[PDB]
Amino acid sequence: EERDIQKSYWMEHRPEVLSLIPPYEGKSVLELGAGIGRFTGELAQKAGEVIALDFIESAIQKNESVNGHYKNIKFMCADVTSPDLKIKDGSIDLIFSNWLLMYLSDKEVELMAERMIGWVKPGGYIFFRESCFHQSGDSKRKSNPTHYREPRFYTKVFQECQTRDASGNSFELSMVGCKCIGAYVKNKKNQNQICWIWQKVSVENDKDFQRFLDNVQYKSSGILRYERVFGEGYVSTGGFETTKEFVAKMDLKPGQKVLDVGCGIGGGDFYMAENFDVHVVGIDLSVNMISFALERAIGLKCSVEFEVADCTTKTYPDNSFDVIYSRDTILHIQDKPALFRTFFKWLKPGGKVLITDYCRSAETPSPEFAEYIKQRGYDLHDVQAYGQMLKDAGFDDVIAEDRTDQFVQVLRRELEKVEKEKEEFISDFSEEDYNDIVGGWSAKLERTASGEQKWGLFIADKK
């Protein structure tokens, strides 16, 4: 039994947290797992009345020895899960705990959310703080029964919690805050102390609809494994480092307008807009790509806009853009000359096009390369011929560079990093995700080594 294991464990065995908890001056507070009263004394000094509870007799007795002089505390030795624990429903302004749910089974956490919402009055708060993430228990002794859960579990249990009064008003919990104890630092290892603040609200939601919405988002998230390999914000060759190199060639001036054809999740667009004070118009055929772009754009003050659109059918007025930019997108486009003629009209006189794209050697594709091209739906040309297409469309000063050596260098570095981080990659993602990346990068390196696959950089300008 969980109860016996946790009780046995516990038988053998601050200003920041208080600053985080909802206002408690004058209020009715229930402290669960009070221990010897590290918080109890502080709470009581401002609270109207406190109930301090712990299932270890000696702990709660020590609490009473130290804090008993505060006459507004009632002390209880009880297990929070016990049916015999009697606390008047709707009587509590604030339920406070600090390390507690980690000592309950998964089903008991669900039980406790229900007990807690019952105990708190409408408009009241629940605060809890737990040690999270499985790896937090790697160095744990076999007889340490502490549950180090993924934070998503606590969020989901409490967001689905529902109850009724008599008769028969529905109540749920809204999430007021989720906070990292000691302040969140990006990429910082071992930040596992997390707290939540929930408020009891009058509402009846359909949890199946919420699960549906979350599941739609989860299904759309495959692109994140590619972002992991390329770099935050990027889903093509070389991430930020290649983007910085190529954007420099545009000579972007403040106030210019850039079209990004195949904008993906927007990282290159944020980079251009923020660093060069240009307006970027980004289009991508994928709803899911644009969803991430829009989300990462929230809060940014740079001038970017994103739309789901097919670049082969989208229309813009003549002379709309100073620059048309595209990275590893146009291999999907079957009629490049038509696309380029459209680019020529969209660009203002004096404008510029910059494209990187997958290409092939001039030689006829091997049967294996041809089948790959067909399955993927690609339209590949040699670098010189691609350049000629830009010339044919009316562009001047066409530069067409074979950058395959750079492509290979970048592929090798991208693959090596994933391989060296295999365990974490798999924990964050999955084994199948890891295999997809390693397999795909290995195959690209095979096709480059055979001499069949190429990578090109194209720059041209208009009149």
Ligand X SMILES: Nc1ncnc2c1ncn2[C@@H]1O[C@H](CSCC[C@H](N)C(=O)O)[C@@H](O)[C@H]1O
How many whole angstroms separate alpha carbon 404 and alpha carbon 406? 5
Cα 126 to Cα 34, 121, 174, 193, 402, distances in angstroms? 15, 10, 10, 17, 61
Find the binder of ligand X among 18, 20, 41, 56 (CB under 6 A): 56
Q: Among 286, 303, 388, 406, which residue sits at the site for ligand X (rule: CB under 6 A)?
A: 286
Options 75, 103, 127, 344; binder of ligand X; rule CB under 6 A: 103
* Residue nearer to ligand X on the CB measure, 100 or 250: 100
Q: How far is CA 382 from CA 85, 222, 285, 357, 372, in A?
A: 77, 31, 25, 11, 17
Q: Does the footprint of ligand X cover residue 426 (CB under 6 A)? A: no
- Please give the backbone phi and psi of residue 169, each rounded to the nearest 5 degrees, phi first: -70, 135
* Inter-residue contact 276 to 302 (CB < 8 Å): no
Q: Is 262 annotated as a binding residue?
A: yes
Q: Whose CA is closest to 149, among 94, 198, 88, 108?
A: 108
Q: Of the candidates 289, 373, 398, 457, which one interacts with ligand X according to CB under 6 A? A: 289
Asked if 302 interacts with ligand X (CB under 6 A), we say no
Is residue 327 a contact point for ligand X (CB under 6 A)? yes
Query: Which is it for strands 304-308 and 193-202: parallel, antiparallel or unpaired?
Result: unpaired
Instruction: Retrieve residue 32's tokens.
Output: 């669960």
23 token code pair: 């206002």
User: Does the annotation place 268 within a ligand binding site?
Assistant: no
| Residues within window 150-179 making contact with ligand X, judged by CB under 6 A | none
Residues 6+ positions from 24 with CB-CB distance below 8 Å: 43, 46, 47, 93, 94, 96
Only segment of 307-315, 381-389, 390-398, 434-442 that touches ligand X (CB under 6 A): 307-315
Produce one character per residue of 177-206: b if its CB has 16 or more CB atoms within 10 Å, e if not.
eebebeeeeeeeeebbbbbbbbbbeeeeee
Q: Which residue's CB is nearer to ligand X, number 52 or number 117?
A: 52
CB nearer ligand X, residue 120 or residue 235: 235
Q: Is residue 283 a contact point for ligand X (CB under 6 A)?
A: yes
Looking at 172-180, 278-286, 384-392, 432-440, which segment touches ligand X (CB under 6 A)?
Answer: 278-286
Closest contact distance (angstroms) between CB of 53 and ligand X is 6
Q: Which of 106, 114, 310, 396 binds ligand X (CB under 6 A)?
A: 310
Q: For residues 65 and 60, what is the distance between their CA atoms, to the nearest angstrom? A: 9
* Closest CB to ligand X among residues 192, 286: 286
The answer to the question of residue 340 lying near ligand X (CB under 6 A) is no
Q: Binding mask 10-39 vs ligand X (x if CB under 6 A, - otherwise)?
A: x----------------------xxx--xx
Footprint of ligand X on this chain (CB under 6 A)?
Answer: 6, 10, 33-35, 38-39, 53-56, 59, 79-81, 98-100, 103, 234-236, 262-264, 268, 283-286, 289, 310-312, 327-329, 332-333
